[PDB]
Design an enzyme around this catalytic site. Sequence first.
Site, PDB file in Angstrom:
ATOM      1  N   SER A  92       0.768  -1.257   0.000  1.00 45.39           N
ATOM      2  CA  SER A  92       0.000   0.000   0.000  1.00 45.39           C
ATOM      3  C   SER A  92       0.799   1.307   0.000  1.00 45.39           C
ATOM      4  O   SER A  92       0.205   2.369  -0.196  1.00 45.39           O
ATOM      5  CB  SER A  92      -0.975   0.039   1.167  1.00 45.39           C
ATOM      6  OG  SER A  92      -1.896  -1.031   1.013  1.00 45.39           O
ATOM      7  N   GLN A 142     -10.855  -4.757   0.954  1.00 44.58           N
ATOM      8  CA  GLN A 142     -10.407  -5.606  -0.153  1.00 44.58           C
ATOM      9  C   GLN A 142     -11.480  -5.709  -1.243  1.00 44.58           C
ATOM     10  O   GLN A 142     -12.702  -5.804  -0.960  1.00 44.58           O
ATOM     11  CB  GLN A 142     -10.099  -7.014   0.383  1.00 44.58           C
ATOM     12  CG  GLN A 142      -9.030  -7.084   1.491  1.00 44.58           C
ATOM     13  CD  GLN A 142      -9.458  -7.896   2.755  1.00 44.58           C
ATOM     14  OE1 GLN A 142     -10.555  -7.703   3.314  1.00 44.58           O
ATOM     15  NE2 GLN A 142      -8.573  -8.776   3.209  1.00 44.58           N
ATOM     16  N   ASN A 167      -8.697  -0.518  -0.146  1.00 44.82           N
ATOM     17  CA  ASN A 167      -8.162  -0.736  -1.487  1.00 44.82           C
ATOM     18  C   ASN A 167      -9.192  -0.467  -2.577  1.00 44.82           C
ATOM     19  O   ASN A 167      -8.856   0.115  -3.620  1.00 44.82           O
ATOM     20  CB  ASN A 167      -7.665  -2.181  -1.691  1.00 44.82           C
ATOM     21  CG  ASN A 167      -6.431  -2.522  -0.882  1.00 44.82           C
ATOM     22  OD1 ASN A 167      -5.746  -1.656  -0.316  1.00 44.82           O
ATOM     23  ND2 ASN A 167      -6.115  -3.800  -0.857  1.00 44.82           N
ATOM     24  N   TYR A 184     -10.331   2.912   5.715  1.00 44.77           N
ATOM     25  CA  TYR A 184      -9.230   2.521   4.835  1.00 44.77           C
ATOM     26  C   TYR A 184      -9.641   1.371   3.915  1.00 44.77           C
ATOM     27  O   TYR A 184     -10.189   0.347   4.361  1.00 44.77           O
ATOM     28  CB  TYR A 184      -8.009   2.158   5.659  1.00 44.77           C
ATOM     29  CG  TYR A 184      -6.740   1.926   4.856  1.00 44.77           C
ATOM     30  CD1 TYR A 184      -6.299   0.628   4.593  1.00 44.77           C
ATOM     31  CD2 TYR A 184      -5.982   2.988   4.367  1.00 44.77           C
ATOM     32  CE1 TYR A 184      -5.128   0.391   3.865  1.00 44.77           C
ATOM     33  CE2 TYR A 184      -4.804   2.755   3.639  1.00 44.77           C
ATOM     34  CZ  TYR A 184      -4.397   1.452   3.398  1.00 44.77           C
ATOM     35  OH  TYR A 184      -3.241   1.213   2.706  1.00 44.77           O
TER      36      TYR A 184
END
Length: 358
Positions: A61, A117, A149, A147
């Site tokens: 990341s 995810q 992705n 947070y």
Amino acid sequence: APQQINDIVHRTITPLIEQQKIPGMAVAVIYQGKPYYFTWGYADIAKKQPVTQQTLFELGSVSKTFTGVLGGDAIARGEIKLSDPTTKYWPELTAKQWNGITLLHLATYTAGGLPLQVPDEVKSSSDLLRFYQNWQPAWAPGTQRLYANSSIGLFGALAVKPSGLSFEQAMQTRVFQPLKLNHTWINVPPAEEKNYAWGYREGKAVHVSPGALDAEAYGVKSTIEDMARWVQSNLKPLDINEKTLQQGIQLAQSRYWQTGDMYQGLGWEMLDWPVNPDSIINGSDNKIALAARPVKAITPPTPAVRASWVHKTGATGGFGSYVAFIPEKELGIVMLANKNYPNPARVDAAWQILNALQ
Ligand SMILES: O=C(O)c1ccc2c(c1)C(=O)N([C@H](Cc1ccc(O)cc1)C(=O)O)C2=O
């Protein structure tokens, strides 16, 4: 190196490697603008290949810092605006939960609870559309940070759409090439495989697996030399001759949201310097870092503050990385390892080194 830098680095890192059982590690300290490099141990245990200054590590990341700067560069180019609705760049995203969700929300994890995810099930462009169409927000846009992705990953994919380029081509031509990051890769070429460290998870050699939005969220591999150069570029963006890239770097370090003592940039996260080391150290622990937190909007965003501790942790299954720098002091650090070890140990080592040299 100056003996001060040598001693603090080795006295901090040697114990860390031992305590965490890290196979290989590279560290760069940027001190008064100049890089100093350190390496230990093995890139490949089985083949006895040592970590060198040319060894590639999976950034995980920390890749989000590149994605944020590339997005910044698109803004400076006039190709996108952070105030644009997501649907402007993906009209097929017709589900009504997307109304009011802007590129800002995607870039800063504030869309309303997009997952950490992207599911493994999601592979095709049609799979991805279906995933975002079906997603149900827990919260209104711009109220909570989670947070994700799937959030900044989507941001990166959309930010390059007007350019006409693939995400990889945009990144190569607009960020890597201008900054002479000539050993930084989304996809490691065969010619460079000799330099690609193995990650180690439960003692098994592992590399990151392909996944939807991998390039955008966690897929950059780089050397300690290139990452030192990345830190230098972000420390002093005015030295950069490409106007939009200089500007993009500044936008990635603007403060969009506050939660506790941290501020959200594009990829980068910032705290005021001087920092309370317990804030960054404890704050770097996952599930404070990965927890749902209400955010205060910074209206309008504060331009990059020189007196900031600017940082990002990143991992893959087999790797652990950390970058931190303080623009005001021309001071920074990169730590790359081929084991995923706890964030707090990274940030503590980083603070011990930078505090000493500060
Ligand atoms: O091996 C992989 O496929 C892999 C891919 C992406 C990430 C990690 C592992 C990973 O550990 N992180 C963390 C976030 C994260 C933490 C825990 C977790 O279970 C998943 C992601 C980060 O770098 O921010 C990632 O973002």
